[PDB]
Amino acid sequence: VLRDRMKEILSNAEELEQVVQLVGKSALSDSDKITLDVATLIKEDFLQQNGYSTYDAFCPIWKTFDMMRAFISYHDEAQKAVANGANWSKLADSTGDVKHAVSSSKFFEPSRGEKEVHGEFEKLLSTMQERFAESTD
């Protein structure tokens, strides 16, 4: 379910990329900004690979799913907020703490939560929900 949505975000991003170049940034809606913004998170964490093996460059497949789970759980919430009313800028301020964590996912190791996935990632799914309820209201 996750794999199809990751590509989808990236597809729309290419289309957006041409409008962004030409017209600018001053014309895109709230939904479109998010698409680019979650795209940033994937570009940062998956495409870059810090070191030979330092900075925990080794990700097991189960960790990777958890890294992805955190971004797409964020995308669906993020899509609901703008739609239910919440400015792109407002939504970015209010997300704050849970956003920094998902950004920081690559330095962390799964060998100190369970052994292949992180207790930290399980806790991350609860934190997302809580944040969202405050922020929307």
Binding site: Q18, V19, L22, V23, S26, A27
Partner: protein
């Protein structure tokens, strides 16, 4: 000058870029121009509206000044040093562009002065003041379209420049380049074969001969 081999993939995508750009910015232009026409008509009407209502109230005040004795209006201008009707400005995205809009708020700082009361002469100024406040407030709200209208006025000129600029300079430059390097590129593949084939014929002939 232009690359010797394979600019074509790049130039293909350059060609595509150019062409999408022209279409979208002409749509953006199309929406701005369409909205602007409608706003132009609202404005021509509104100017007549504002002028007639403002003047009716103008004539009522002028008669009043003369009847009361003395040029009252100099006195009123000094004495007034705060404003009721102010505006707080807000941004509205109409046709992908951000415009400035104005929203009036009526502050109750002033509502009566020390020149709207004088006794008998004072009752006349008062009847005048009331026609002017009602007439003017409408005029302030109509004036709000003007600010946006001027920003629209500016943006249409820029946007038009761009549709024409992609059209004339970029697209035909892209045609001329793509063709010259395609023809060179093809020439390499065919001449290569021709030189090799021409030599083979000789090599084959020698062996048959000896």
């Amino acid at each position: 000058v232009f690359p010797t081999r394979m600019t074509l993939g790049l130039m293909k995508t350059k060609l595509k870029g150019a062409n999408q750009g022209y279409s979208l910015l002409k749509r953006k232009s199309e929406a701005l121009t369409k909205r602007f026409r409608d706003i132009t008509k609202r404005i021509d009407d509104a100017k007549q509206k504002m002028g007639r209502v403002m003047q009716t109230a103008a004539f009522s005040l002028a008669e009043v000044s003369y009847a009361t004795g003395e040029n009252i209006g100099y006195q009123v201008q000094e004495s007034v040093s705060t404003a009721r009707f102010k505006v707080r400005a807000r941004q509205e995205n109409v046709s992908g562009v951000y415009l400035s809009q104005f929203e009036s708020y009526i502050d109750p700082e002033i509502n009566d002065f020390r020149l709207t009361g004088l006794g008998r002469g004072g009752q006349q100024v008062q009847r005048a003041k009331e026609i002017y406040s009602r007439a003017v407030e409408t005029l302030v709200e109509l004036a709000s379209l003007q600010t946006a209208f001027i920003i629209l006025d500016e943006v249409i000129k820029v946007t038009n420049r761009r549709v024409n600029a992609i059209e004339h300079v970029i697209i035909p430059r892209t045609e001329n380049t793509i063709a010259y390097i395609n023809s060179e590129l093809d020439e390499l593949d065919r001449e290569e074969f021709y030189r090799l084939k021409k030599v083979q014929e000789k090599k084959q002939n020698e062996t048959a001969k000896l």
